[PDB]
Symmetry: none
């Protein structure tokens, strides 16, 4: 272990710091007419650590609770 | 760890400071006639930390509460 | 950390100071005839911190209250 | 922090001093005939700090009061 004057390193630390903080993007569009809706699209993309997905699933009920 | 005269660094800190404070943009348009509406569009885009999305979902009821 | 004679910095601080104070623009037009209206358009665009959107939603009733 | 002989600075302070004092422009036209009106247009544009919009909304009743 030798200290470095620069914070540059390999991609392993970049991947770790990307995964630990978690990434999720939600996109949805709703179209309605005269009060009623005729279509509704909704989706999301998730890339995060495995620990938070258990918590997501138990929030939505997949995990035992 | 060596102190630097300039605050410039890699993109990891930029990504972290972007994600922690949270980003959300809401766009919607409503058109009405003689009192009644014939169409209404509404949507939003969210890019933030995973911690605040649990709070959003429990505010809207997805998370267990 | 080295003091600078000029306040110029990167775009991160500009983005932070833009987002913290909040931005919202409201545009609406109403057309009426002989007392009654035949059309009414209203919309707004919001770009602000995530903290104030919970307060907006609870003011309009989306957040639990 | 170094004192300057001139008050010139970046655009951040200009934006802050523009937003804090608040901007609102109201435009409306009313046309009437033999006592009764046949049309009336009214609109306004607002660009100000988020704090005063809560006060506007509670004045018009949107905010809880």
């Amino acid at each position: 272990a030798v200290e470095k004057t620069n914070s540059s390193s390999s991609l392993a630390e970049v991947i770790d710091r990307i995964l630990d903080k978690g990434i999720v993007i939600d996109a949805w569009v709703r179209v309605s007419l005269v009060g009623i809706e005729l279509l509704a699209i909704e989706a999301r993309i998730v890339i995060a650590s495995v620990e938070t997905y258990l918590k997501y699933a138990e929030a939505v009920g997949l995990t035992q609770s």
